[PDB]
Design a protein around this ligand. Structure first.
Ligand code: 9TP
Length: 581
């Protein structure tokens, strides 16, 4: 164990990443804090760190990272008149102060939306103070996505700098810059959502859950790798994400680097597909390994019949070490099925487990578990059916109309759920259609069913903040593996009383003419959820009818005699038809 963890981390990560990482740590705890303040605090922490690196025996160098950093956040956070319910945390010591900070993370911060300035402007600000410009990027995303995988956020910042470096010297700056930022925005939302799930698993379902998940995913990725190796990897990788989720961002970054290093110094025993990745700079390398394509599986692997049903020691080995035996089954099953979703593999693993508990406590266990594998079959076919059906539906509806289809279906299921949430979740689910139906009906399952998990988790966590439907609460709390079926099983809420008619939520304005097409869509899908809430018995024929009116008048009013008052009479037409009763 090192004396002075801050020195140890400062030396290991180096100054630039140390600062960026603390800045992320601060913004993911204090999302409402202004930029300038966080930087000042990070600067002071970094000032102090250097003293400990110089001399580890100097005054506070032996304090934990959280004590040191926590004391530092609270200088601005103790302000109750500006931050409210967050010096709740500052009244505490470590570790309870940190436990407090983690539980006050807000998945939906009431934060001002980003202005996006002219390209001229951004590029000016970039050359002027390159370092501030990047911090301002780190800060904005971190406070908006308090679960962004911090090391990966350094990677994003780096791509972000790279974009401005390249495009700000381009002949056409806009034509170069914007697609890169558009890709970066999408890739970032995806990354954030994926990490929320890794964190929710750990924090709500425990380390054992995350491990099973990783064994499964890594086994599919590295099918030539031995179990001992995968287990080692699962271990390191869990230690890393546990750290990140628990707010130990420096150790997380460090331990992820060590890992990325291990992987590359052991390529020949992991995968044949890491060659290019391990030639990249640190951030890029680590990212590349993380998203690397599955290796080819060894040819002619045997069947699992021998070890997991036919051996005489199935019950012994099970009872002799249940977790490593299940890990093995899960490893052996996942290696051989990169075409199964990670969730399917966990279900089969869970089925095999529950089947051994029942059968090892039986007269003749082998006679009892002989069937087991046959029982996996309807579990495998079930996701296949849904994906087949949803992809046909998407193929004839397109992303947008497909999202609206989900918007209506999902609103009727759980109309207490908040409108912006319904809109976000349904729009994202629509993105499975685009991302996954694209693939041949044979790689679709991991893409489709693993991504829904990420999307269903967003719903779960956005709903957790201010819960309004016990049925969502139940599906989200029940298991993690049963989330999709539990949500699929939900029936239309006939118990729910229709919302009254608010005029403003159905009146539009001249500002809508200045929005992107995407925003306009979002604007209208927002109206649609509100429509269903106000008339849940409306028909598909009726709903899509009222839809095209919204569509048509936007067109006519964005052109007409003063666009502002134009949305207004349409507001007056709808208002009069409601008072009418
Ligand atoms: C991870 O990827 C994501 C990126 C973003 C957005 C985002 C989205 C974009 C974009 C730029 C930006 C940047 O926005 C700019 O951030 C700047 C940071 O740099 C500094 C400034 C320099 C000089 C004055 S301010 O200015 C800021 C701009 O105002 C702002 O638009 C990101 C920086 O931090 C964000 O949050 C921002 O071009 C078109 O699409 C949002 C996400 O979800 C909401 C997300 O997941």
């Amino acid at each position: 164990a090192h004396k002075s963890e801050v020195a140890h981390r400062f030396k290991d990560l180096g100054e630039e990443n140390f600062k960026a990482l603390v800045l992320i740590a601060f913004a993911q705890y204090l999302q409402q804090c202004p930029f300038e303040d966080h930087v000042k605090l990070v600067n002071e922490v970094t000032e102090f760190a250097k003293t400990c690196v110089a001399d580890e025996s100097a005054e506070n160098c032996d304090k934990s990272l959280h004590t040191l950093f926590g004391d530092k956040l609270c200088t601005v956070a103790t302000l109750r008149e500006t931050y409210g319910e967050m010096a709740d945390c500052c009244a505490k010591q470590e570790p309870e102060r940190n436990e407090c900070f983690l539980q006050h993370k807000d998945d939906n911060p009431n934060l001002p939306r980003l202005v996006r300035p002219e390209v001229d402007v951004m590029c000016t600000a970039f050359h002027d103070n390159e370092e501030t410009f990047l911090k301002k990027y780190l800060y904005e995303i971190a406070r908006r996505h308090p679960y962004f995988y911090a090391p990966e956020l350094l990677f994003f910042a780096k791509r972000y700098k790279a974009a401005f470096t390249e495009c700000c010297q381009a002949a056409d700056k806009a034509a170069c810059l914007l697609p890169k930022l558009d890709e970066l925005r999408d890739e970032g939302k995806a990354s954030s959502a994926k990490q929320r799930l890794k964190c929710a698993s750990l924090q709500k379902f425990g380390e054992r859950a995350f491990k099973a998940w990783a064994v499964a995913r890594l086994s599919q990725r590295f099918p030539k790798a031995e179990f001992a190796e995968v287990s080692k990897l699962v271990t390191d990788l869990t230690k890393v994400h546990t750290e990140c989720c628990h707010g130990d961002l420096l150790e997380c970054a460090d331990d992820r680097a060590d890992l990325a290093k291990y992987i590359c110094e052991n390529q020949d025993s992991i995968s044949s597909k890491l060659k290019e990745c391990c030639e990249k700079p640190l951030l890029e390398k680590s990212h590349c390994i993380a998203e690397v394509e599955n290796d080819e599986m060894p040819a002619d692997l045997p069947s699992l019949a021998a070890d997991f049903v036919e051996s005489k020691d199935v019950c012994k080995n099970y009872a002799e070490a249940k977790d490593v035996f299940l890990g093995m089954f899960l490893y052996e099953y996942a290696r051989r099925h990169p075409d199964y979703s990670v969730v399917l593999l966990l279900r089969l693993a869970k089925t095999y487990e529950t089947t051994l508990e029942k059968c090892c406590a039986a007269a003749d266990p082998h006679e009892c578990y002989a069937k087991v594998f046959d029982e996996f079959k309807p579990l495998v076919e079930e996701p296949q059916n849904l994906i087949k059906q949803n992809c046909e539906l998407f193929e004839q509806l397109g992303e947008y109309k497909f999202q609206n289809a989900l918007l209506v279906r999902y609103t009727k299921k759980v109309p207490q759920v908040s409108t912006p949430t319904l809109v976000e979740v349904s729009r994202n689910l629509g993105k499975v259609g685009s991302k996954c139906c694209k693939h041949p009906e044979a790689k679709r399952m991991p893409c489709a069913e693993d991504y829904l998990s990420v999307v269903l988790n967003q719903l779960c966590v956005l709903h957790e903040k201010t819960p309004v439907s016990d049925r969502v609460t139940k599906c989200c709390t029940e298991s993690l593996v049963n989330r999709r079926p539990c949500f699929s099983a939900l029936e239309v809420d006939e118990t729910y009383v229709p919302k009254e008619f608010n005029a403003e939520t159905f009146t539009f304005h001249a500002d809508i003419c200045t929005l992107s097409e995407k925003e306009r869509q979002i604007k209208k899908q927002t109206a649609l959820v509100e429509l269903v809430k106000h008339k849940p018995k409306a028909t598909k024929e009726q709903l899509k009818a009222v839809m095209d009116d919204f569509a048509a008048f936007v067109e006519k009013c964005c052109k007409a005699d003063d666009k502002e008052t134009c949305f207004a009479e349409e507001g007056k037409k709808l208002v009069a038809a409601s008072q009418a009763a």
